[PDB]
Chain A
Amino acid sequence: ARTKQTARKSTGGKA
């Protein structure tokens, strides 16, 4: 099984 990461918002660049 795969664990989903706690998603981060982009401002026009990584996480």
Chain B
Amino acid sequence: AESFDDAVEERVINEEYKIWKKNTPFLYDLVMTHALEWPSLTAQWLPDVTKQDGKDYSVHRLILGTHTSDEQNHLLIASVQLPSSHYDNVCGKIEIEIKINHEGEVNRARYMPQNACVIATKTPSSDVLVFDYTKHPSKPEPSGECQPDLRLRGHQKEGYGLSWNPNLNGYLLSASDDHTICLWDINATPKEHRVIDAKNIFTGHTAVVEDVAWHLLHESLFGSVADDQKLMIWDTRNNNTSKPSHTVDAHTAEVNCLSFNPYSEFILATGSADKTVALWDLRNLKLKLHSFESHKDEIFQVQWSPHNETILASSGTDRRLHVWDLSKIGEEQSTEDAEDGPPELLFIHGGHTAKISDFSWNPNEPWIICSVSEDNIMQVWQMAENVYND
């Protein structure tokens, strides 16, 4: 590069990666790398696991998407062979099973927990689509025409935030660049071209709403995060959709993501452009529980471990994925361990050489993550047992 600092930075990345590759047998129990035709902006493991009898591997599936320059975009279902002859002329195959025609890049794709065949998608346009992949062929049509099972109206702009209610069937939330949060009941009688209008529109934010998340236990409770630096807590039982139950001045920059703790009904996390992950207690949102510092750039995704209550991970533009352990907060460290980071930082994943777009914890196999980057790479990996043990 033209700048010395720029040329060094590009070289350090390439050099760090070569070291990461050579050190993978020390840090991981599993590393699987796959280069997708196009980069995916989304990643989410489907909940099902198919164990073939007398086979040394199980088949896991994952929802992916495409992001292309000028080609036909697709919603993808990929199969992954994980441990429960394998030589290619690398160890476990990653394959695209379903390709469903999509209009524009898939900003986010999430399955409905009550019917995992149903997947809502965020488009680069105002509509939010719904697809039943069993109501579509495995091979897409060269017609290139996107035929969603439902078109959800209410937004004026594209977005990323998307969350299905785990306790209330068909209740879908969506966040948009238009500053709104839309709610739909996909069970409502559609109209026109399978078009369902927003049941409610929440207008509390005064900037781009980056994410939405339903509380995992209270079916009426959800949280939102925006570029206005706020975290907002909403109750659908209230009739005022312009004022949230709580407004939290969460960060010193844009708030890009949030995730509720799957084991503690009061604990929640937010990720920000201020390069920190904040911990929140719904019982006292005026005071921040803790700040996770060590990310070297804007954070875009936060996800709690589906298996361990004290574990969460964050990813962003710094091309790294950090895994944090709440139980290690305020622990004593030797001066040598202290220089590597805070005790709460359990692991740094340096497998990606580009911005991490999304990641997903495998719900059936503990410590397995799938992360997708802007350079088309998708990694299925698992840190070494010794990292989280002893």
B375–A14 touching, CB < 8 Å: yes
Q: Across the interface, do A8 and B105 meet the contact criterion of CB distance under 8 Å?
A: no
How far in angstroms is the closest Cβ of chain B from A8? Answer: 7
Determine how close the nearest CB of chain B comes to the CB of A6; give it in whole angstroms: 6
CA distance A12 to B376 in the complex (A): 9
Q: A interface, by DSSP: helix, strand, loop or mixed? A: loop
Tell whether, in the assembled complex, residue A2 and residue B160 are in contact, meaning their CB atoms are under 8 Å apart.
yes
Q: Are A7 and B68 in contact (CB under 8 A)?
A: yes
Instruction: Tell me, in angstroms, the Cα distance from A4 to B39 when the chains sit together.
Output: 11
Interface readout for A1-15 with B: 1 if CB under 8 Å, 0 if not? 110111111101111
B6 interface contact, C-beta 8 A = no
Cβ 8 A contact of B37, one of A1, A6, A9: A9
Contacting residues, chain A, for B375 (C-beta < 8 A): 8, 14-15
Q: Are B227 and A2 in contact (CB under 8 A)?
A: no
B67 A14 Cβ-Cβ under 8 A: no
CB distance from A13 to the nearest CB of B (A): 5
Report whether B35 and A9 are in contact in the complex, using a CB–CB cutoff of 8 Å: no
A6–B35 alpha-carbon span in the complex (Å): 17
**C-alpha gap A6/B227 in the complex (Å):** 23
Q: Mark B247-260, 1 if CB is under 8 A from A, else 0.
A: 00000001010000
In the bound assembly, the distance between CA atoms of A9 and B256 in angstroms comes to: 27
**Contact of B67 with A9 in the complex, beta carbons under 8 Å:** no
CA distance A10 to B197 in the complex (A): 38
In the complex, number of A-B residue pairs with CB atoms less than 8 Å apart: 49
A1/B177 in contact, CB under 8 A: yes
If A6-B69, A7-B67, A7-B69 touch, whether A14 touches B377 (CB-CB below 8 Å) is: yes
Total contacting residues, chain B, CB less than 8 A:
27
**Please, how many angstroms separate the alpha-carbon atoms of A2 and B159 in the complex?**
10
- Say whether B300 faces chain A, with CB atoms less than 8 Å apart: yes
B38 proximal to A (CB < 8 A): yes
Asked whether B68 lies within 8 Å of A10 as measured between CB atoms, the reply is: no
Chain A residues contacting B71 (CB-CB under 8 Å) are 9
Given contact pairs A1-B177, A2-B300, A9-B37, A14 touches B353 in the complex (Cβ within 8 A): yes
Contact of B69 among A2, A9, A12 (CB under 8 A): A9
Contact with A along B217-251 (1 / 0, CB 8 A): 00000000001000000000000000000000000
Task: Contacts A2-B160, A14-B353, A14-B375 given; indicate if A7 touches B208 (C-beta within 8 A).
Answer: no
**B160 adjacent to A15 (CB under 8 Å):** no
Q: Which residues of B contact A9 (CB under 8 A)?
A: 37-38, 68-69, 71
> What's the Cα separation between A14 and B375 when bound, in Å?
5
The interface residues of chain B lying within 8 Å CB-to-CB of A12 are 35
Report Cα–Cα, A6/B68, bound state, in Å.
8
CB of B224 to closest CB in A, whole Å: 15
Closest to B374 in A: A5
B36 CB contacts on chain A under 8 angstroms: 10
Q: Cα distance A14–B376 when bound, in Å?
A: 6
Residues of B contacting A2 with CB < 8 Å? 160, 210, 256, 300
16 new A-B pairs (CB below 8 Å) besides A1-B210, A14-B35, A14-B376? Answer: A1-B177, A1-B208, A1-B227, A2-B160, A4-B67, A5-B355, A7-B38, A7-B39, A7-B67, A8-B39, A10-B35, A10-B37, A12-B35, A13-B35, A14-B353, A14-B375
Question: What are 9 A-B contacts defined by CB distance under 8 Å?
Answer: A1-B227, A2-B210, A4-B41, A9-B38, A13-B35, A14-B353, A15-B39, A15-B375, A15-B376
Closest 3 CB pairs of A and B: A10-B376, A14-B375, A7-B67
Enumerate chain B interface residues (CB-CB to A < 8 A). Answer: 35-39, 41, 67-69, 71, 105, 124, 160, 177, 208, 210, 227, 254, 256, 300, 353-355, 374-377
